[PDB]
Each structure stands twice: as structure tokens, then as C-alpha cells.
Amino acid sequence: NNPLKIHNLRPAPGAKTAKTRVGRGEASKGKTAGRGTKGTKARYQVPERFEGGQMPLHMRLPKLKGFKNPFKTEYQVVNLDKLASLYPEGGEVTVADLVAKGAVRKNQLVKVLGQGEVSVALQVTVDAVSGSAKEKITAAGGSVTELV
Amino acid sequence: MKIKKGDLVQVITGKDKGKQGKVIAAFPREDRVLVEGVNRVKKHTKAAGGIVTVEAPIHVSNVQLVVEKDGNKVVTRVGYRFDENGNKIRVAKRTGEDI
Amino acid sequence: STIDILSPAGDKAGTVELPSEIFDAKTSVPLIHQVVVAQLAAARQGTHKTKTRGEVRGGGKKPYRGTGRARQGSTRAPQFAGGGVVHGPVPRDYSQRTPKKMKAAALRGALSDRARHSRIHVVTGVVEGEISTKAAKTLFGKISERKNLLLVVERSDEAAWLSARNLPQVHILEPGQLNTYDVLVSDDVVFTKAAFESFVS
RNA sequence: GUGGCGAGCGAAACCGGAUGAGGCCAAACCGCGGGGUUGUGGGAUCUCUCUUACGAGUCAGAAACCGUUGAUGUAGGCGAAGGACAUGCGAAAGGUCCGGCGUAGAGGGUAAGACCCCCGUAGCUGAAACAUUGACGGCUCGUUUGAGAGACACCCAAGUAGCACGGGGCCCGAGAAAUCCCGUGUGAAUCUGGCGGGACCACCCGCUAAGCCUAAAUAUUCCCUGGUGACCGAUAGCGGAUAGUACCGUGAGGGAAUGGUGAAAAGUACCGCGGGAGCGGAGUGAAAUAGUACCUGAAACCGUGUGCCUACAAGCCGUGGGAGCGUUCGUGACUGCGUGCCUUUUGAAGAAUGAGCCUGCGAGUUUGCGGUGCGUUGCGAGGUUAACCCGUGUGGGGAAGCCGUAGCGAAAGCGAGUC
């Protein structure tokens, strides 16, 4: 009885942590407010990319090897182990249906990969497939039809 | 200012409740009126210089019109009504009569 | 659970089933607490500002130079009387982004809590025919004598809005804008049958 | 991507949204007018075939005015319902009892907490006059041959495009540097014309520079009307409870301080001391240590009275022990111990810095679908919206995106592997 009233709401214990008010009193974060005395850090911030004049970490190790491809495309990949749990009775496997089962992002290229085992026949209609995955699908009586 | 000059009013909230009286002069800008008989102060004035007793204004919302209904007197609030030519006439509300 | 519909006069006019998913959902105090605190914070207007030593008018000059006084860079420094305010308030929006599911769940919890204590009521109408604050007052007296009452009615039903809006203790809402804060404040919740179906659907 | 590849800087394609609109000239040709307006190229000129009233307006595609009338604005009007008893002190809005209105329980005042005492609010209602803006009529304007086929290579914005040099801006800091803009020289073509698609060439794709006009989504508030505040409340809030005044400077310019009697002056008649000021009676007031020096009236600071101690004593002024005296409490004869506070220092009572004293003010804040870790909450192989849309509010919708879902490699690429 006595239902929930708006003055009965309390947060979960440990949810809200009281602020830390530095600079009030000497029985707390006292006069220095947790900084020490008279350094560059007693009044200012020291940038992270600065090793006191010594050659910075980011300036004495060589640049990374190689270039980058502006037009490289990455496929959303589905391993056979997690593709044999979405279809525990076989059937046709389309790309737009794989999207609806939360296995690949929308509007991308799918590429079934070969980790795991498949025990039922699947008719996968995807953009590509790896060699091991293709063998495993065919062994289980399925057929693989690529669009690309 | 509904309280016109020269009306019969009754003090409803003040040192002197009950007392009726006429409206001597009305100040429609500071919302006060003079009712003869109430708040009669004794000014100490010098030179015939001496104690003089005259009434000081009371707030308009502390008086209210007295309309006669069925013999004795009765305090009433005041509304308006047009007759035929768009002429507002003070109409009593306790009685519905014309004051 | 089933609850009786009351006709505008206070008589029974049928029965309705409270959907369990709405009126029998779990009440999580921490979840309700966050949503309600978010509501009150979002209601804050937050229009409030002060002038820092840059915006105070004047003080562009260095007041003086071996003078024997303190060194000062401007007459509008924080420590000066009439100087600028340091770390003062500024205009800011206090609204919070709360997930949709948390909001909906909290309202379900609040309504479920009221239902469990049998404080949900339904009426086919508030007033029949003419607008009357008296008719609404009599109806609500029959339903409950408690201080806080919440009336949920479609905005197209002017009769109920106009009749009940003046009552000191009654807070009126559309079905679509039923919100957690109003439910918790109110001791009882009264739906119009049109409102109840609109909300549940 | 750019960068003494340092500090830093930093797009575009495309996606989701707010609003949505297209017109006209130059040229050729004909006599300032006609003509024509193009990217599926179109127009001119010539030959052949067929055919031969209507709309648009106050606008970017022209431009005014006259009237009739609709709406809004600049004054306003009405607008519901409370009494009795006692108390209070001085005053009832507070207490008790019974009532009433409510499409009005917003707010402000009224001699203390008022939905019903007043001003108002809900709800309706109102304009001779002039302004803003619609609709209509007058009025104004535009059009009144058109279509197809074939010819012809006549026109399609010139000191311009391009190119050379020197520069500017773009993610691009002159680089292999495209596109865009400027100055100097040189300097075309007209549809087989020309420009771009990141040096350049060819093909392919798009498009017609060297002419113009264009509302809507967008930024702002000196000013006006109506409102709001987990904004300030007299050292605060604008500098200004009006002041850019007083004052400072030759001058540009700088630039203050001062709010509060009481419900109502009822602001003290009269008497006395005194030159007056001021005060003691008296009077008003609820209250006169509320007397125009005025609500409350702290501290520093200055006095009167009073209890105790104090003129053989060396005192960071306190503290432990302790007799005595006195309107537990006040004081403290005598005795033991006892070298201030902060800062900064290896180390300070330090003869190292800062502080005459009180009161008030004065230093870890805010933003972000930022980064990161922890706690908690919701959902959980999923989670979640941004802009924006609807609504009175904090409510609902919105999947553009982002994070998780597979990694390795310079990359092609391969993929539980990969180099």
C-alpha cells in the first residue's frame, strides 16, 4: 500500500557520485588543489606530444609503410558456424534476407567465409565466397551462386 | 472607480467596521476615498493653531455601496447595464435594482 | 485485471481489461528516477547570465604604474568591487538525451504501479451535454476524494477539457502526451474510454 | 589529404532533412523598333508540302491608379460568486461554522495567508479616423497563323578563351598541378565551334563561358506589444533603482557615490532649559532606542556602572595545579609547562615575504550524438539516433549515420587465416 510517490524516488546505490570540490579548506583538496608547488603544471597544462625537447616518439620512428587504396571495398562477412544457426533447416539464403537477421550491415557486399561446419543444404546467393566455405557448402548438398 | 463621489457606503474592513457615511471626495488615481466619519485623525497644527480632527482617506476596496432592500440596509457589489442607447448605469447586484 | 467503466453520473457502464504489458510491467525505481529527473531538468528555462571581466564596461586601462600599492591590470578584475564575475553562470540547455526504451518503460512502470494499487479509473465521459465545472466536480468526488487527480482525454473533446480544467486538483493530458512525471504526482488516473483505447492501441 | 609532413590545417562525392520557380536579352537577318533564345542544338536566309476571340497582372516574366468590400492593428466595454461569531492587536486576507461561482482556483493590490473587497482572468464584444493586407469591378498588358521536309554554312557575347611570366584561393605551403581570380605581353574559333571529367594524349560522358533578373528555406534586434526564469536584489543586477551626470584630462578619453519611518503624517499642538541646535515632560501612533540623522541594527571602534585582580615585577600574553574573593558561574594571589599565522625552504619564532582592524566581495566553471576509465541503469547480437516533423510541456516519430559483427597485407588480394 502507499504507492510510489515522486518523493520516494532514489537512485540505484553507487549511481550518483558527489562532486570533488577542490580548493575549499585544508582538510580536503587543499590550497594547491592537488597540483604541488610552482611548476609548469602548477598553473598550466603540458601537452602529451612533448618529451621535454628530446625528439618526440612520433617524430623519430619512420612513417608507416605503403599507400592506401581510395576505392578498396570491404565485405560484410558471415562465417558458416554463425550462418548455420540462422538457418537450422536449410533453404535459400539471400542478401536482403541476411540483413533482416542482423548478420550484416545494410547496403554492402556480403562474402560468406568458411569457419565452422555446415550440416544442412543452403542455396546462398551472395556477392562472393571463400574457397573453403564453397567446398563446405557443396559438401553439405548446397549450391553457391555468386552475383559478382 | 465604481465608487462615485457622493454615495452611501459601508466600511467593511477597517478600524471602524459598520459605520456608513457619505463620500466627501474621491481620488480615482491613488484608489482612495473620503467617507465622512471614519479614520478621523487629530492633526497637531500650530498657528487658531491647535488640535484639528478631520478624516483621512480610506482605501476604495475597504468600502462598498449600501443599497436599501426590504427595509434595513444591505451592502452590495455594482455591475453595469445598457438601457437602450449604450449608456452604462450603475446596477446593484445584491438586489438587481438600479443604484 | 478488469476495471469498471463509470458513466458520467457515476454508474457502471461496462468493464475493460487492463493490458498486462502496459499496466503490469515491472516498476524499476532507478529507471523511473532517471526519467523523472530528466523531465524536471528539461523543464528548466536556463536563461541566466553574468558579465565577466571582458564584458564589464570599461577597465581597458592599466590603473597605474614604485607606487607602493598592489599590482593591478584593470579596474574590472574579479577581485575588484564592481569587477567581472569569474566562473559565473551562462545560458545553457539542461535537457537530457534519454533512450526511447527507458522513457516508455518508465511510463509503463508508473502506470503499472498505480494499477496494482487500484488507482486507474475509466469513464465514458466527463460531462454529458453542456460544459459544467460542477458536473465534473461531482463526478470526480464520486471517483476519489484524494488530493491529486490526472484526467487523460483527447484534445478533440472540449467538453471534458473546459469542464475540468478549472478544478484545482485535476491535471489534464492528451493520451499521446501522457508522461511519467504527471502519473507519479497524481494519486488517481482517470481515462475517457476514447482516451483509453487511443493510448493502448 | 595537406604541413620547417613541425605547431597545425582539412575537403568532396554521396546520404537524411527545411523551401521549392523559373524568366529575359546579345548576335546573325529586316526597317531606336521587329527578329529570335539554343544542348535531342537552336536561330537566320531560301526552296517545297500541309494547314491557315484568347490569356496574365500589381510579380523575377511591364506598370500605375479609382472604387466596393473582408480580415488584422493603433483607444476601449461587459464579465460570475461570502456571510455570522470570537480573537488579535491596531488592522482579518488568519481561527470556527455554514455557504456560493467556476469556459473565471492566472497574476497584482487591499492596514497579517483573499476564487467570491478592488484591479483583473475564463468567455464574449467594439472603430468616425488612418495603417497593413486580401477578393472583386474598372483599369493595364500580352497574343491573334502554324507545322513538317529539304537547302545554306550566315549567327550563336574578343583584345575575351588559351598559351608565356609574376601572383591569390582552393584539402593542395608551386609541386607532374587540374579547375577558379588578378596584372603584363602574345593571342583564336562559331556547331567539323568550344569547355570540363586533377599533368598530358586518344576514346567515351556531360555541358554551351566571355549577358541579365529572380521569392522560399538563412543571420539580426536599436525599437514596439504580450509573457517567462531551480536569473540579481542595492559592494548584486546595466557604469547608471537613471548618470554618461558630479569629478578628472588641453584632447581623444576615463568616470563614480547616495534605495527602505508608518497602514495612514496622524511628521510631535502645549509647557519648560537654551541665541539656536538639542533635550525633558505632554500628545499621535499598535510600536517614538519607528521622530523626516527614521524597518531589522552585527563587528571593528568609543564610553558609564559594576564583581575580582593589579604599584619587588621580566609576561607569543596561553595552558595544567591552585588559595582567596563575589553582583555551577565571574576573577585569578602563587606555581609547572610554553620561542605567533601563512608562503617558501634541507632547515623559519625567526632579524626571510604578506597581513593595522572589522564587515561584505574574491579563484577548479561551461560547451560537445568530443577522447578515455570506473559506477549505475535500459536493451541486449544487437545498441542508438543527428538534422528535422507533429504537439500545450518534459511526449511521439525520424536509421542519414555511428559503435559491435573478421583479420592480415604497401596494395592487388586472400580470408580463420593472412604477410
Cα-trace Rg, chain A: 30
User: Do the Cβ atoms of B80 and B46 come closer than 8 Å?
Assistant: no
Burial (CB count within 10 angstroms: exposed 0-12, middle 13-18, buried 19+), residue C24 = middle
For strand B20-27 and strand B32-35, is the pairing parallel, antiparallel, or unpaired? antiparallel
Q: Which residues contact C44 (CB under 8 A, 6 or more apart)?
A: C94
Q: Which backbone phi and psi does B88 adopt, to 5 degrees?
A: -70, 130
Side by side, which strands form the sheet with B32-35? B58-59, B32-35, B20-27, B8-11, B63-68, B73-75
* Cα first-last separation, chain C: 17
Burial (CB count within 10 angstroms: exposed 0-12, middle 13-18, buried 19+), residue C126 = buried
**Structural element, H or E, at residue C21:** helix C20-23
Chain C window 47-106: which residues touch A at a Cβ cutoff of 8 Å?
none
Reduced to 3 states (helix: H, G, I; strand: E, B; else coil), residue C12 is strand
Resolution to one decimal, Å: 3.1
DSSP state at residue B62: G
User: Do the Cβ atoms of A114 and A136 come closer than 8 Å?
Assistant: yes
Determined by which method?
cryo-EM
| Strand D: positions under 7 A of a protein C-beta atom | 1, 5-8, 77-83, 90-93, 101-106, 109-111, 114, 117-119, 228-231, 235-240, 244, 254-257, 263-270, 283-286, 342-345, 360-369, 375-379, 381-386, 391-398, 400-401, 403-407, 409-417
Q: How would you label A93-102 residue by residue, b for 16+ Cβ within 10 Å and e otherwise? A: bebeebbeee
Q: Which residues are paired to A129 by β-bridges?
A: A112
Reduced to 3 states (helix: H, G, I; strand: E, B; else coil), residue C114 is helix
| C-alpha to C-alpha distances, B32 to A9, B1, B9, B23, B78, nearest whole angstrom | 53, 10, 13, 11, 17
CA B50 – C1' D280 distance (Å)? 22
The length of chain B, given as a count of residues: 99
Indicate yes or no: CB of C27 within 8 angstroms of CB of A4: yes
For strand C149-152 and strand C188-192, is the pairing parallel, antiparallel, or unpaired? parallel
When CB atoms are compared, the residue of A3, A8, A11 closest to C114 is A3
Q: What is the DSSP string of A20-40?
A: --TTS-SSSS-TTSS--SSSH
For strand C170-173 and strand C149-152, is the pairing parallel, antiparallel, or unpaired? parallel
Burial (CB count within 10 angstroms: exposed 0-12, middle 13-18, buried 19+), residue C74 = middle
Cell of A145: 551462386
Reduced to 3 states (helix: H, G, I; strand: E, B; else coil), residue C195 is helix
